Structure formats: C-alpha cells, structure tokens
Design an enzyme around this catalytic site. Structure first.
Site, mmCIF file in Angstrom:
data_model
loop_
_atom_site.group_PDB
_atom_site.id
_atom_site.type_symbol
_atom_site.label_atom_id
_atom_site.label_comp_id
_atom_site.label_asym_id
_atom_site.label_seq_id
_atom_site.Cartn_x
_atom_site.Cartn_y
_atom_site.Cartn_z
ATOM 1 N N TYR A 43 45.617 33.260 42.793
ATOM 2 C CA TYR A 43 45.432 34.052 44.082
ATOM 3 C C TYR A 43 46.020 33.424 45.272
ATOM 4 C CZ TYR A 43 41.523 36.706 41.826
ATOM 5 O OH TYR A 43 40.610 37.476 41.113
ATOM 6 N N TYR A 68 36.756 38.417 49.210
ATOM 7 C CA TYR A 68 36.308 37.238 48.111
ATOM 8 C C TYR A 68 38.016 36.706 48.085
ATOM 9 C CZ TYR A 68 38.877 39.927 44.338
ATOM 10 O OH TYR A 68 39.796 40.440 43.500
ATOM 11 N N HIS A 70 34.660 46.147 35.887
ATOM 12 C CA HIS A 70 35.805 45.513 35.861
ATOM 13 C C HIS A 70 36.190 44.616 34.581
ATOM 14 C CE1 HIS A 70 39.092 42.903 37.467
ATOM 15 N NE2 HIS A 70 38.179 42.047 37.029
ATOM 16 N N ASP A 88 43.646 42.868 34.928
ATOM 17 C CA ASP A 88 43.381 42.139 36.013
ATOM 18 C C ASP A 88 44.733 41.419 36.564
ATOM 19 O OD1 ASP A 88 41.165 41.082 38.083
ATOM 20 O OD2 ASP A 88 42.108 39.113 37.352
HETATM 21 C C1 LIG Z 1 35.894 36.363 41.792
HETATM 22 C C2 LIG Z 1 35.476 37.161 40.557
HETATM 23 C C3 LIG Z 1 36.617 38.210 40.285
HETATM 24 C C4 LIG Z 1 36.206 39.282 39.794
HETATM 25 C C5 LIG Z 1 36.064 40.660 40.524
HETATM 26 C C6 LIG Z 1 34.953 41.437 40.481
HETATM 27 C C7 LIG Z 1 34.994 42.730 40.317
HETATM 28 C C8 LIG Z 1 34.191 43.666 40.265
HETATM 29 C C9 LIG Z 1 32.660 44.210 40.372
HETATM 30 C C10 LIG Z 1 32.612 45.470 40.012
HETATM 31 O O1 LIG Z 1 33.605 46.404 39.673
HETATM 32 C C11 LIG Z 1 31.268 45.702 40.028
HETATM 33 C C12 LIG Z 1 30.709 44.534 40.531
HETATM 34 C C13 LIG Z 1 31.802 43.402 40.763
HETATM 35 C C14 LIG Z 1 31.738 43.151 41.917
HETATM 36 C C15 LIG Z 1 31.516 44.410 42.898
HETATM 37 C C16 LIG Z 1 30.569 44.222 43.753
HETATM 38 C C17 LIG Z 1 30.248 45.508 44.755
HETATM 39 C C18 LIG Z 1 28.967 45.552 45.156
HETATM 40 C C19 LIG Z 1 28.027 45.845 43.970
HETATM 41 C C20 LIG Z 1 27.439 47.112 44.074
HETATM 42 O O2 LIG Z 1 26.477 47.595 45.196
HETATM 43 O O3 LIG Z 1 27.740 47.914 43.449
#
Ligand SMILES: CCCCC/C=C/C=C1/C(=O)C=C[C@@H]1C/C=C/CCCC(=O)O
Ligand SMILES: CCCCC/C=C/C=C1/C(=O)C=C[C@@H]1C/C=C/CCCC(=O)O
EC number: 3.3.2.10
Lengths: 316, 316
Positions: free
Chosen positions: A237, A154, A295, A106
C-alpha cells in the site's frame, strides 16, 4: 473441498539474491497462477486449488512477496508494482513457463492487471476478483482520488511505517478473526481510522468466529504471519505515487488477451460499480458477479467462484 | 545447456510423516519424472532437463530417497523397491498427477521398471537407461546369479553396513572423480573388492578429472553427499531378497504400456546383452543403443540421450 498444507507440493524459486517466492502446486494442464491480496496467503485459495486441478489445470498458488514462506525484505520500494511484476516474470522464467493464466484478488488482482498490461506476452489470460482495472490519469495523482473516497481512509492509516503494524501484530488471532467475516458480520471501523484509534476499536477483544471460517483456518493464518508480520504486506500500500508513475507509462496501450472481471455485491471497498467502464478499455472483457459476497471472495463464496473460474478458463 | 541449481524451481513433497522428496522442476507439458541411480543426484540429469523442457515437457528431476535434499532415513528396508515405489505413487498423488512418464537410469531404472509393472495406471510410459527389466524367478533367488558374475562382486562388498560407507566417505572428491569417468578412463577395481582392498586401490590419491566432467560439477556432488553420506544410497543395494519376493508377486504379468530400453555399449556392469528378450514381457518395447557410452550415460553421451528420449517421447 479444501487443502491440507502438509499434503501439498511446496515450491521455492529465487527471483533475485535477496528474494525467494514460495508457492503450492497441484494438477496438470495449462498453468494457472493464483495471486492473493492483503493480508492473506496462498491458503486463501484453498477451495479453488483442488477444484481447478480437478478441472484439468496446473495450479500454482503463490505466497506473494512479503507473505508466508516467501521473502519479506523491509524496504517499501521492494513492493511497488514494477518490482513485483518483474519478479513474477523471473518466477515464470525459472520454472520454464512461457505463459500462465493469472488470477488475482485484491492486491493480487491489481498485480495481475499490471502483468497483463506490461507483460502480455507472459500472460495467457487474466482474471480479477473484486479489483477493477482503472487506467491511470496523468492529471489525477493518487492521494487526491483516495481523499475523495471516505471508505479508502484506512489506506491513509496504512502509510506511516510502524503504525498499522503495531495494531495488526498485537493479537494475530483477534486480527484475523476481525478481518475475515461476511459483510453482515463485520464491525470494522474504516472511515476515520487514525482518529477512531484503529481498525479494530469497535470490535471485541475476543471476536466470535465468522460463519466463513474455522478456528483451524484462523490459526493457519496466525502461524503464517509469525515469520514476517505485517510490514511487507503493508508495503504493498505504500507505493501509490511510484505505481501511478509506472501506470502512466502504459500510455493507453490496450489489454487484448482474454480477460475476466468478477465483482462481489457486498464488497464495500472494491465495489462493483468501480469496474463499470472497463469494457471501454477491454471490449472483449467477460464478467462474473457474485451476490451476497463480501470482500473475502474465495472464502465467502467458493462454489460460485469455482464455477465462474472453470467456465471461463474452459472457454477463453 | 546444463543447469544452474539456484536458477531452478525446487519442490518438496512429504510422502509420509518423516519422509520428503526433493525435486527440480522445469517446463510445461506432459509430466516426465527423471529418476537417477547410484551414487548420483537430480543433477545427473543436468543436460536432459532443459532439452526435455524445450521439447514441450514438464520435467521433474528427483533427488531419490537417500540423496541430496530428500530424506535419508538409516533403515535398510526403507529402500526396498516396494517402499520406494509406493512413495513415488504418493508423490504423484500429492502433486495431483494421475500419470507421468518415468525415465530412470541404474537404480532409478530398476525403480521405473517396478513402477511400470506394479503401477501401470500411474505410468504413461517408461524409459530406462542401461538397466534392463528382468523377470523374477520364483525358485532361484538372484543370490547365485549375482555370485556367478564376477563384475557384481562390488555388490557383495556393499552388503555389510558401514564398510562401503567408510571407503566412499573418506574423501568425497576422490570418490566422485574415481567413479565418474568414461569407461576407457576407469581404474575401478570391481572383481576382487572385499579382498583386494576397496573400490579405489588403483585410483590415484588425486585422480585426474575425466573428460566427461568439470571440477565445479564434481564439487556439486561433493556438497550434496555431505548432508547424509552414503548409507541411504548403499541401502538401495541391500534389499535383494525383499525385492525378489515383491517381484515374484507380479505372477508373470506383462508390462503393457509404452516402453523404451536404452543400452550403452561400454557399460561393463549393465551390459547391453542383459536386455535381450525383454520384448517377451513388454509388447510395446522400443529400443535405443548408444555407442562409445559407458555407465554414466547422461553425462557421457548427453546429445544422443536427448535425441533418443525426445524422439520416443514425441512418438509413444
Ligand atoms: C485492512 C484490511 C483491508 C480489508 C478491506 C476490507 C474490506 C471490506 C469490507 C467489506 O466489504 C465489508 C466489511 C469490510 C470493511 C467495510 C466496512 C464498512 C462498514 C460496515 C458496514 O456498515 O457494512
Ligand atoms: C559401485 C559404484 C557404481 C559403479 C558402477 C560402475 C559401472 C561401470 C563401469 C563401466 O561400465 C566401465 C567402467 C566402470 C567400472 C567397470 C570397470 C571394469 C574394469 C575397468 C577396465 O576395463 O580395466
């Protein structure tokens, strides 16, 4: 399989007057420096640390700046890639390491790519989990590319100092339980975040525990984020323009050291195809790919990550 | 080069619930663990640390238990060789080190010999400055042999808790300045101590600075000893009978790993002739000898020490 914190060797290096970096150290052999992402910990490497040490490597798993036991100054610009990279160089210097292998995830992945780019002499080899290396375009400023991509909304919610902090800090257990989930267990709101209320608005007041993590694991993160909270982490960020400016100074120099790009099928933000033309800039690039992996790559698929890392470390 | 403390990496390992060992770490390569003597510090290795790191070694210079930033429990028996050695094994275990070279001086030297005797599988090779290996005799306790040597009278003065503590602690700067001197500059009173009125009767109230050290060096030792004082350190001298009983359980086994004994011409307590016949117990013993070198070997002849160690490390 994992690490018990009170059972580790804990090291501290002052990299400048204000700032010390903490890390955990295990093993002997070539130095491998592990660099976590947002909002994580050295502990995110808990399954890799014993595995790499057992495969004959000396592992240094960082608390990155802003996290855990490392310092967390409040100024945004203390967290631009340029500052963080110099500090990582000083870290090596003070330990008397001329090089190390850098492995990030990340935001840590981003860091390690810029280390390889600007300090190839200090980087034996570089590996990234999920984070591609994308050369800056001097005609594409960062805020335009981020608006084009809706799942990157985000990152906009993260810009204003204090806002994401108050939501993330409100209930740390809820924060970590809502974040650290398999992709299929996630109910995070990523697409219209400011207007939606926040990241967690369609997520329970007491989420269930992901199949990836234990309550005890969750509580270690809770406890780690008490000391400094989310400001420093979020500042990672808040340097987009500064980081873009610095990357444009690369001026198309190429990464020539050994390099490994690992993609995760179900990471929905750092999607595999964002890495797709990396071999145009790193032609000897090696790859790994992990199915059914979200992730939180190291936690979701620790066995596969370990396998991919040790194979690559042992060959390049 | 010497070492600047805040430019070092500092490590902390909890070897048992309320006991943690501090160390400084520098360099890449085979692990070399330096163990200082009484009443010293990791900083007594200040000239060896960068020399050894530059030579291709990963140096861990300890604060031994009782000193500096390491734990200093008050109980006498926490400082018997058996307890001290098992902690160093645990140290290695927690760092993920299957072996290290052990290099000691004075009481550290005594420790490395017990490590090599009892834990040879964890000791790649052993080197001692000044301190000989002495086979224990299962009949004569060294009590009588200690009484026999007049220059070991200071050891009897060290037995009663609180007595030597009060003299050593009264004026730290006078303590270190009176101790740390070339043999030709010493005015220490070693033969009649219990009776003759302390180690420092003949020392000026304000001693001059030995040619071996600077004021800033002395002041580092003062600052270190403010934390826990002299009770832990002195406890190293208060376990003669326990150490003798543990050493008798060796049942005359030999030390079979690579070993180096360095004698110092002008150490008048750990005299070179005390090492005679060590090769009858230690088949792969190499030797070094330093002329015009007193007790504070690392500090008195740092150049000769560096050369001697590096040459032996690179060959054996
Ligand atoms: C602020 C937190 C940063 C972390 C980044 C989140 C990353 C990744 C995700 C995925 O790869 C799967 C779920 C989380 C957030 C993404 C959501 C998309 C909608 C959920 C779906 O319909 O699959
Ligand atoms: C008890 C504190 C540790 C001190 C150990 C001192 C060790 C060694 C010395 C030498 O090798 C030379 C001087 C000191 C102390 C010995 C002194 C003998 C009397 C000095 C003289 O020759 O007049």
């Amino acid at each position: 399989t994992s690490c018990n914190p009170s059972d580790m060797s804990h090291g501290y290096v002052t990299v400048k007057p204000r700032v010390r970096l903490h890390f955990v150290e295990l093993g002997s052999g070539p130095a491998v420096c592990l660099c976590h992402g947002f909002p994580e910990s050295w502990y995110s490497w808990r399954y890799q640390i014993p595995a790499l040490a057992q495969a004959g490597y000396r592992v240094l798993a960082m608390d990155m700046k802003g996290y855990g036991e490392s310092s967390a100054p409040p100024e945004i610009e203390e967290y631009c890639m340029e500052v963080l990279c110099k500090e990582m160089v000083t870290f090596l210097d003070k330990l008397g390491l001329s090089q190390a292998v850098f492995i990030g995830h990340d935001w840590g992945g981003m860091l390690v790519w810029y280390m390889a780019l600007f300090y190839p002499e200090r980087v034996r080899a570089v590996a990234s989990l999920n984070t591609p290396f994308i050369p800056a375009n001097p005609n594409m400023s960062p805020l335009e590319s981020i608006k084009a991509n809706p799942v990157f909304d985000y990152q906009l919610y993260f810009q204003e100092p204090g806002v994401a902090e108050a939501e993330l800090e409100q209930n740390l257990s809820r924060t970590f339980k809502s974040l650290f989930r398999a992709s299929d267990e996630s109910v995070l709101s990523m697409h219209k975040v400011c207007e939606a209320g926040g990241l967690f608005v369609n997520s329970p007041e007491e989420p269930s525990l992901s199949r990836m993590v234990t309550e005890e694991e969750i509580q270690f993160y809770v406890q780690q984020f008490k000391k400094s909270g989310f400001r420093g982490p979020l500042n990672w960020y808040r340097n987009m323009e500064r980081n873009w400016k610095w990357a444009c100074k690369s001026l198309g120099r190429k990464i020539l050291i050994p390099a490994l790009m690992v993609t995760a099928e179900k990471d929905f933000v750092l999607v595999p195809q964002m890495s797709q033309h990396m071999e145009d800039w790193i032609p000897h690039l090696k790859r790994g790919h992990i199915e059914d992996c979200g992730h939180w790559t190291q936690m979701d698929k620790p066995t596969e990550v370990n396998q991919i890392l040790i194979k690559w470390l042992d060959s390049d």
